[PDB]
Amino acid sequence: TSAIRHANKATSSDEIVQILEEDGVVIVESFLSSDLVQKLNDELDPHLAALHPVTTKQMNDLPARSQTFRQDLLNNTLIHKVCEGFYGPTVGDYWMSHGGVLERGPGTPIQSLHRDEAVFPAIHSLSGSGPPVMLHFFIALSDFTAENGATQFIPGSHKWADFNDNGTRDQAVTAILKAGEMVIFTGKTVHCGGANSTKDSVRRALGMNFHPWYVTPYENFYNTPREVVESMTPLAQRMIGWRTLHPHSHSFGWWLIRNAEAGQALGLKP
Amino acid sequence: SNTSAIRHANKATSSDEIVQILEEDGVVIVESFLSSDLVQKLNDELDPHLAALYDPYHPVTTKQMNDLPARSQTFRQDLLNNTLIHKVCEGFYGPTVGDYWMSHGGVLERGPGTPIQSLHRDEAVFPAIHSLSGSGPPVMLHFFIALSDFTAENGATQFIPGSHKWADFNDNGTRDQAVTAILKAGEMVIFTGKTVHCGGANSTKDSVRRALGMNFHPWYVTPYENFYNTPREVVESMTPLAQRMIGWRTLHPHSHSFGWWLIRNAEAGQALGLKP
Amino acid sequence: AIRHANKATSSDEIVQILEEDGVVIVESFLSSDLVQKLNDELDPHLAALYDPVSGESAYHPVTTKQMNDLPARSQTFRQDLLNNTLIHKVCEGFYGPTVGDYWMSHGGVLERGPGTPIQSLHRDEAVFPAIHSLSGSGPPVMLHFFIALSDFTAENGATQFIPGSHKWADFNDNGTRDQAVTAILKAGEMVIFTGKTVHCGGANSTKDSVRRALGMNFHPWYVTPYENFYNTPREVVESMTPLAQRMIGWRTLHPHSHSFGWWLIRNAEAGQALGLKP
Amino acid sequence: TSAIRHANKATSSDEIVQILEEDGVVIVESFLSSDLVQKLNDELDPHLAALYVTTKQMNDLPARSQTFRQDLLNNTLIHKVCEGFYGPTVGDYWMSHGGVLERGPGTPIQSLHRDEAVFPAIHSLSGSGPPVMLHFFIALSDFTAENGATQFIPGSHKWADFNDNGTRDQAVTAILKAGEMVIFTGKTVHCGGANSTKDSVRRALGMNFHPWYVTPYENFYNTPREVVESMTPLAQRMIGWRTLHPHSHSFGWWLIRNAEAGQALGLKP
Numbered sequence A: 001t002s003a004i005r006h007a008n009k010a011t012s013s014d015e016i017v018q019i020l021e022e023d024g025v026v027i028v029e030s031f032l033s034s035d036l037v038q039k040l041n042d043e044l045d046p047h048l049a050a051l052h053p054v055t056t057k058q059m060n061d062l063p064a065r066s067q068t069f070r071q072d073l074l075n076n077t078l079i080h081k082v083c084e085g086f087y088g089p090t091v092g093d094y095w096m097s098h099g100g101v102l103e104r105g106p107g108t109p110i111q112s113l114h115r116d117e118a119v120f121p122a123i124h125s126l127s128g129s130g131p132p133v134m135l136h137f138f139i140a141l142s143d144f145t146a147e148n149g150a151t152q153f154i155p156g157s158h159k160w161a162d163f164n165d166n167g168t169r170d171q172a173v174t175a176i177l178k179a180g181e182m183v184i185f186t187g188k189t190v191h192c193g194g195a196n197s198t199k200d201s202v203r204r205a206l207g208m209n210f211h212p213w214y215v216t217p218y219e220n221f222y223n224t225p226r227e228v229v230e231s232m233t234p235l236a237q238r239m240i241g242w243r244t245l246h247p248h249s250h251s252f253g254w255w256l257i258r259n260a261e262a263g264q265a266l267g268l269k270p
Numbered sequence B: 001s002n003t004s005a006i007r008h009a010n011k012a013t014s015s016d017e018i019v020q021i022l023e024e025d026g027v028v029i030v031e032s033f034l035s036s037d038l039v040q041k042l043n044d045e046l047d048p049h050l051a052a053l054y055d056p057y058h059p060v061t062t063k064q065m066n067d068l069p070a071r072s073q074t075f076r077q078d079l080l081n082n083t084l085i086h087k088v089c090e091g092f093y094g095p096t097v098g099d100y101w102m103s104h105g106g107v108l109e110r111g112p113g114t115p116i117q118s119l120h121r122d123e124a125v126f127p128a129i130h131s132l133s134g135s136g137p138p139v140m141l142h143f144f145i146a147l148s149d150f151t152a153e154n155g156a157t158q159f160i161p162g163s164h165k166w167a168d169f170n171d172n173g174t175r176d177q178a179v180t181a182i183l184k185a186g187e188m189v190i191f192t193g194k195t196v197h198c199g200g201a202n203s204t205k206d207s208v209r210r211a212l213g214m215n216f217h218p219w220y221v222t223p224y225e226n227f228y229n230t231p232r233e234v235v236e237s238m239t240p241l242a243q244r245m246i247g248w249r250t251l252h253p254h255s256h257s258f259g260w261w262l263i264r265n266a267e268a269g270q271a272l273g274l275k276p
Numbered sequence C: 001a002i003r004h005a006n007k008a009t010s011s012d013e014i015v016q017i018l019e020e021d022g023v024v025i026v027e028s029f030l031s032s033d034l035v036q037k038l039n040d041e042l043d044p045h046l047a048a049l050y051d052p053v054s055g056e057s058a059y060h061p062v063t064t065k066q067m068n069d070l071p072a073r074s075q076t077f078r079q080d081l082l083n084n085t086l087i088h089k090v091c092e093g094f095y096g097p098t099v100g101d102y103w104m105s106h107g108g109v110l111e112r113g114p115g116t117p118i119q120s121l122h123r124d125e126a127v128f129p130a131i132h133s134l135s136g137s138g139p140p141v142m143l144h145f146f147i148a149l150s151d152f153t154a155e156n157g158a159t160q161f162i163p164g165s166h167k168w169a170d171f172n173d174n175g176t177r178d179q180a181v182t183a184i185l186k187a188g189e190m191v192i193f194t195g196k197t198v199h200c201g202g203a204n205s206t207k208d209s210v211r212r213a214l215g216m217n218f219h220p221w222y223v224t225p226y227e228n229f230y231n232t233p234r235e236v237v238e239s240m241t242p243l244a245q246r247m248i249g250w251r252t253l254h255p256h257s258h259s260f261g262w263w264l265i266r267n268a269e270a271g272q273a274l275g276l277k278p
Numbered sequence D: 001t002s003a004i005r006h007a008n009k010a011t012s013s014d015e016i017v018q019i020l021e022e023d024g025v026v027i028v029e030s031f032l033s034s035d036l037v038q039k040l041n042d043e044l045d046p047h048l049a050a051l052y053v054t055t056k057q058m059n060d061l062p063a064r065s066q067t068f069r070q071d072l073l074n075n076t077l078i079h080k081v082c083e084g085f086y087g088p089t090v091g092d093y094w095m096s097h098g099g100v101l102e103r104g105p106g107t108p109i110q111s112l113h114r115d116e117a118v119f120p121a122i123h124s125l126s127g128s129g130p131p132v133m134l135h136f137f138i139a140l141s142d143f144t145a146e147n148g149a150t151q152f153i154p155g156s157h158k159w160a161d162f163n164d165n166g167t168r169d170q171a172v173t174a175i176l177k178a179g180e181m182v183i184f185t186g187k188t189v190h191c192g193g194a195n196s197t198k199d200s201v202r203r204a205l206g207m208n209f210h211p212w213y214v215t216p217y218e219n220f221y222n223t224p225r226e227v228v229e230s231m232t233p234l235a236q237r238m239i240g241w242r243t244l245h246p247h248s249h250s251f252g253w254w255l256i257r258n259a260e261a262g263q264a265l266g267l268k269p
């Protein structure tokens, strides 16, 4: 019960979506290869270097910064299958709200329990009856250990009747992960970062937070250089707001320019 | 007393009373909102663009046009900075929301022979919001300016007051519950995305009904229009408030006070070359 | 209670049910190929309907739709439907001796999408008070062939009828909806009814399904058609058979009464007078 | 140096024709009232905004501007100078092109040129060629050397070889305030200036007239029938809706079935 179910290579995307619906969190083992993890870390380290006790480090605008995030991660088939299964029929389309690298180094103080969808009071007031909004893919660019303070979760807290109750830390299960392993969770599930005993090792994660088409992304990508945008696939461009969305509700389109496809209107390929 | 109608708001009415009428009734009429000169140049700025859209198998009973900020200077400056619209927006979204922006700005033209519209709520396009019915959060705020006279004969828009509070939004009411909104000049009608309404039939063989709608969203709801193709020279001519209305500035929700719609956790318009 | 009962009956039996009850359901009227050909030809015209330039949405889907002037717009309606032998047999039997000739007053595609309100009980010939005042003793005028271009279900609002209401002595009485029985049809199926038969469209309970129909409303020669077809391009009028041209008012009528003819130009055949072949 | 020879507020139209004969360019002061300039800018602004770089060009003025339809096409000074410019043998004339020109910040300096070069058979006659193009250049905004006021070489319409466009140091700038006009021939060397100003846009209205026998650049037959019917017969002839009456072929030219054309297509006698 007080455990986060693991999903292996033999797990189908339907079962990952089902584990997410019942528990609010799931671990996808062996998601990214160690060679892809290092390629990500190699592309990201110089940007982080252009940033007393160690403090928390963060970085976003990944598409401008990382080619592997631009191509491999934004086009990953498992993430997109889980997205279509999580939002389901009535929603139809989705895009990325936040892509961020998170660093919690030695001596990092422990985080309070929280739900990310608290930034949306109108949805957060619905508690577990609220619609699906945030889908969070947390990839481990380094090992997630108990001592460096791996993120803890409270399974089933996405269904609680009162979201003012964030639970207590003894109901939280640590998510022990290896590099390249992923943890998927909802914006309604209680979680918190851990304290880092390890005063020699830095914990590192890449979060991809998705929204349904009708919820405004946190990240704005108009400043991404045109050449990298034209190098991306149309799916990856739709993820970063450069293409029009196609909700099942308004199938004709949303996020249009003069009732026409947005990316075509400002120079991208049809 | 024996009869009820959409309430009018005169020049001596404050914006607080307009917000009050708006969420008791879901609809309000602001008399003499635009001066005759503003209506005249708005129509003048819009005529050549409509003529280029519609100059060329099908009779044209209906015309639509959007992307107004690129197209109209009076819309770019006068309407997008209008003080009453922003007072009512702040009052409608209130404390918990904080910031807002424009989702859709469109001119609508219904000429002779246009059929009556079905009763509807504009917010049905958001089923996750629509399913909460009258308990749902404020989302759409619609400002409908009359660029021509609104008569029942040319199909003045009809409304059902109080239908924004209904417990079941699968119920759109009946035409016997609808009251017509008669407007003459650049008078305005404000309504919610939860209030049932419909356009009328244009019985006249001569007269064209013309309106300008401005549909606003809270910061967290995706605007229908994308304004990335607006030329930089016209965006730079706009005030920062109007730039935020068309999505070129970051929003500042009360919930996430640090900001939303950012570039590298910094203000978006400055990040892409606009003035701080 | 409506007879969905024309699997194998000939047109004479159809005229017999059509008087006795005022409404009849003809099974398998159009082949699935013709229904697909009609829907394909009609889709672009319905899509362009009131605003050809824009998509006519701005988050406002159009639930109710109407379209006419079909002969200019659809070739299969121009050829297959206007020349259909069963329709002309039924018109023959319904108008009978005294009338002689007939033509089409209205050819229309009708669409009721999700959320469409239920219709009031009515008779179409109420548009002619001088005829409507005669009630059941009045002359035959309107004959309506309603083809289902989609399934006619109880939930999407299939049209309801009151059999025998064409014979009532007082047409101020339109009945009540408990006397109405729904007409359930497949794609190729048709319902025929008179302008004196009480009917109403249903409510569309479905959240996505769109109900679509093609109505062909015919008149006797002496009653003015609702549609004017003179703006039809002459290439299309010349591609039509003389029967189909007479149906859309491009040829003169031959009433039983004034055998010499009606709707002439200088007392001569009209279509020849305006450049069509004899 | 040469200078442009300003005029108006007391000069007769014969004097303007004579200055045009001698220099090929002249400046008419206070040609339009400030109120007329404000109508023109008000009527033209929405059409300029919908035309879809600060440079802009627009024509088909009679459909678009009432003040152009009535005030400018009927202006008495323009017609006196036109009859003086074409003179005896020509007789009748009409407008070939009416256009608003907009040149904003960053506008490059133009090459020295002669507009009549679009007519190689006429242009090859150099200074001895017949009068063809007559250009009226009205200032809808201030014309400053800082915003690129047009420069001219007086007397260059006279030159024996039109392959010589002269040099940029023989050029005189034409400074105009607002509603001031500069008239010039299609044979006079000229060029638009560079607009260094980071802030200001230059607006001009050009009216280019032809003798009766030269084809107008603009076709005005798509002009709406009730705006043409609102125009004076003189203004209707300027836009090609009435027959011309050259002194050469006095019976008429540009006819319909050897009858007056505007009457033939439904206009008033």
Ligand SMILES: [Fe+3]
Pocket (backbone or CB within 6 Å): A114, A115, A116, A191
């Ligand atoms: Fe969190």
Ligand SMILES: [Fe+3]
Pocket (backbone or CB within 6 Å): B120, B121, B122, B197, C060
């Ligand atoms: Fe609406």
Ligand SMILES: [Fe+3]
Pocket (backbone or CB within 6 Å): C122, C123, C124, C199
């Ligand atoms: Fe009916």
Ligand SMILES: [Fe+3]
Pocket (backbone or CB within 6 Å): D113, D114, D115, D190, D191
């Ligand atoms: Fe030039």
